[PDB]
Assembly symmetry: C6
């Protein structure tokens, strides 16, 4: 990506247009990450945010977000599993909403395709796939490079190429990560399953905490504070705002 | 392999067909692993599951599984040893069951052949061998690559190529591994010899524990929970269900 | 860069010209660093210092500094965020001061441009951009090389190239670094958000410490001591002196 | 090496031919190791075992073994030391036995020859020398490769090449190793000088333990258990059975 | 460099000429090192010893040293800083002594030049610069190579090249090093700022210890023991003998 | 080096000639090492053994050793230092002995010559220099290679080349080492300065233990036991048998 010098006098003289956020606290045209241990629900959450930006409803009740074409690249899930996940989500959408989602969302399975962003063929293809789009989701980062995720140099190159695509096309990029990488990212969100401790704190008996997960923004530079959110895992894993009440007075001794 | 974009509206519109499992909790067309310390019985278990999927009887009493051509690639055992294991297993099969196994199972010894999936010759050969088959078993992974199993980058490439073959041919791949690879695998099963503590728990005298092993699925993303299984080692190591009874009231002080 | 041998006799007889400092304690024509944890305010401080040297006012109350052309290279901030930062700073500048800054400061966004000082094309371009200039700011170092920052050999080459550019052109270079690498630098400054301990030491009640940050020179070889400074964070993050006084007697028990 | 698929039906119907052991518990046509600290007596034991298989007497009292041509490759001992070792062993052989050994054993000194199994010239030469032979002994492994023995990738290739030679020619390969690397071997034997604790356990007074060494198979997959053996060190280092008996009641307090 | 065989009979027959020392305990035509933490005063001490060997006075009161052409190569200090140090030193030299120093000392700044002794261009240039000279000072070693100072192999090559230049030209080489290299060096001297404990030992008030430094030889193979020296820091850092008296009876309790 | 197969029948039928030792317990035609911390006296001891094998007297009173041409390669000492060392030693030799030493000993200084045995030019030269000789001494190993002495692979190559030279030419090679390497060597000797503890044990008062050093063979496979020897350091470092008496009854409390 190449940029023209900033017009300093203009920036001083007039108020610049408000920042454009693709996601809460994430500026459009940049790279971000969604992290959590495997199985926490990143793929489901990612699909839901993708569907919302594509034009679907705000089922997650995060802020209302601008709409634009979205491309989701799942490289770890078998296609038939994705079918089932979409069918499950579909139960939460009206006929008009299902249509809007299909009109703005592209899902291209890449399991076994071996994408390597450090290879010209894939960098070129990914950049072309980002053109005209507002968001690109990579699930997960591990399958889009062949470097050591512990090597700062190689990873600075891998992440740098995502920044190049985003800056040149305007299409934001969010990669999922099972868990440095975070040091090279300016926006980071996460998923954290409800712990036994949190279960007691929110009046959820153990045995049931398996159905709740919290989401928040762990790293951001701009925008108003985004409060952590609790989601309930419905049939098929679909996430929806949880209805929970703080257990001010303990039920026993935590 | 290459995939067609997901038809979103169709996925929403009607429930997709049920998932096709090659093994308990493992989706057909993906890669999985069977792990345990050396000498625990992976080769015998693998041969039995292979014989089952090939069309043989469900001697292991694990779930009922779809049948299809199977290719077993033992790269560490002397060919004559494989003959002894087959002969032992044969004593548990009727005439028609032996014919069934023979018609659907191919066993190609590779000791001394040095297969290297990162080499074009072997990748192409292994992919060709997977064509038209339901399952391919690699025994063990160590002899199918020349990388440092501690290196995430190189191993991501090795496992990645197995995913390419499985997704492209539809043939599932399961590799054995002597006790990371777990991080890059979505399905994982294991074998663990009966401990002295477990022997006490199941009323099995110590010294006799050497004849029992437990089999379970430690990592799976889809499907109903698979209950751990206890197997009894018979002549030649052939595995059978074993009917153990948990000692409710201990025989003494464990 | 090339230097002429030192004329010994002349150095003895003539009074050495006063050292030319681009920044407090930093000799013009050398490389230096501004260090701090991400989010402490390096980008804002650097911008204000750059505006001052370019010809703007001494808003920070640091020593008056020689003026000269300045080029600021932000490689991590999206252009729109820079527009906003400039507009905020502009509220502290008169019409004449705004023009002075615009006349002497050049800001070239590099997000996604992937600069690599070890690559001929980039070394040449950066060297070319340093010609005729007083100061060049790299924000941050991590985005100007693809090496391991903990590797002395590689970083010697990276830092060495910045030294070559500064020496040959006369343009000083200051790179930002998010909290080894300081062992290769002769000038280092830092930013440190006020801690609870420091707030009690300076008469700032807790809950208000979020408004203050300290700036100081942690490594220098020449010049009179630069006293640590406390800055108050104003709208948009603009830093202003806001003088504090030491709390001789504690307000309680620290 | 190349193998023919296993004829399943035949393996079921026909009784598998008895496993052919080159050494106790070691299947002919595979790779194995003899391990111990330097100086324990590996070279002498290996020479005696080699002489036996070549057609000499069973001086060691191990199981009678099939006879066949043997090639011994000492890469660490100067030729003159080998002459002396042979002369010492000769005192235990009759005229007819000496001739049998000379007829079936080939000893090619390689000290200073710098064999490297990873080099085409040496892999080809060693493979050629294994043709038509029953056993090939490498003394010791360290002098047949230039890799890091603690590096799994490189050693996989080194050991893999020995497996290829053994499988293709039918000639078993046993390499000596001075006390990871055993994880890649299926057969392992050892030598261990009698310790003070073992001497008291076997009725040997201290000060005499220097005369005894124990031999045993530490890793094996097939065959009836081989009982650990105690050998007495005679002139020149020649090993002979010398049977000991367990000391039921201690001679004091161990 | 190339050497003629030693004439043994001649060496036996008569006592060889006395050893030629370039510095205390350091034989002419070899490599040595001056080590200390950064900021201890190595550059000033080095310049003074250089000025002495060049023909200046023995201000340091170290042994009397043979005179000869000297070349000083400071690669980290801005040229203008060197002018200030020379000017300060000049105040301690008479008119004739200044001329003496100027006639025998060459100072070639190399900041930003990036000398790399492993590169043919620089090795050849440095060797040419050593021709006809008595001493060459490298300040500091870090800027004369691009290797990992932790790597024994590469450093053995770097130091080796310095030995080649010294042995071939006869010009001794001393490199400064900010606190392995010691293992590959036969002569090593150091600087260590006065500790609070040492201050007490020499009746120097704390807070004033900052003006004293001790110089010594930590590694030397030949010559009479060199006694540690205490130096007083004067204006501009110029070093002078300092006449300290050891406090026999302590002033209080150390 | 290449060797003809061993004539087995001949080795059995007749007693082979006694082993030829170049040094106590070291077989001629092999590689050995002399190790000790720097400054212990390896260079002096090495020169003395070299002079003895060359034809000089057994000043060290080790065993009487066969004579043959010797070449000593000092790569760390300045030539003039070697002159002084030889002159010192000369004081202990008669005119006839000095002549014998000069007739059989060649000393070729290599300081700054940068020998690299892994380079064709140097391997070829060293091998040529070993032809017709009985012993070659390298002082020290570090200066004859550019590898990491901690890397077993590279070192196996470096040492292997010395074995190649020795085996092909018959010239033994002993390298000195300041202190793995020892694991690759079959003969090792050492020097150990007298400790305060040893001083008391041999009735040597402290302050004087600096004049005594012990020598022994730490690793050997053949020959009769070699008892550790105590040497006294005379003028110039020349070593001679020390006249010491065990302090059976302590002088106080050790």
């Amino acid at each position: 990506a190449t940029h023209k010098p900033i017009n300093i006098l203009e920036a001083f003289a007039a108020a610049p247009p408000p920042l454009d956020y693709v996601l809460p606290n994430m500026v459009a045209g940049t790279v971000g990450a969604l992290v959590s241990p495997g199985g926490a629900g990143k793929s489901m959450l990612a699909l839901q945010l993708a569907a919302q930006i594509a034009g679907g409803p705000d089922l997650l009740e995060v802020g209302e977000l601008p709409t634009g074409p979205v491309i989701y690249l799942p490289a770890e899930d078998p296609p038939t599993a994705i079918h089932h996940r979409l069918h499950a989500l579909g139960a939460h959408l009206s006929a008009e909403e299902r249509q809007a989602v299909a009109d703005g969302l592209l899902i291209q399975p890449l399991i076994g395709s071996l994408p390597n962003i450090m290879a010209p063929e894939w960098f070129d293809g990914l950049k072309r796939a980002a053109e005209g789009r507002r968001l690109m989701v990579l699930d997960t980062l591990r399958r889009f490079h062949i470097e050591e995720e512990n090597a700062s140099g190689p990873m600075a190159q891998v992440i740098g190429r995502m920044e190049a695509i985003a800056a040149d096309t305007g299409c934001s990029i969010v990669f999922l990560h099972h868990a440095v990488l975070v040091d090279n990212i300016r926006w980071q969100s996460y998923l954290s399953s409800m712990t036994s401790a949190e279960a007691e704190e929110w009046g959820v008996d153990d045995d049931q905490r398996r159905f709740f997960v919290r989401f928040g923004v762990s790293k951001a530079n701009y925008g108003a504070p985004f409060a952590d959110r609790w989601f309930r895992r419905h049939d098929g894993g679909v996430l929806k705002p949880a209805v929970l009440e703080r257990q001010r007075k303990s039920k026993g001794v935590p």
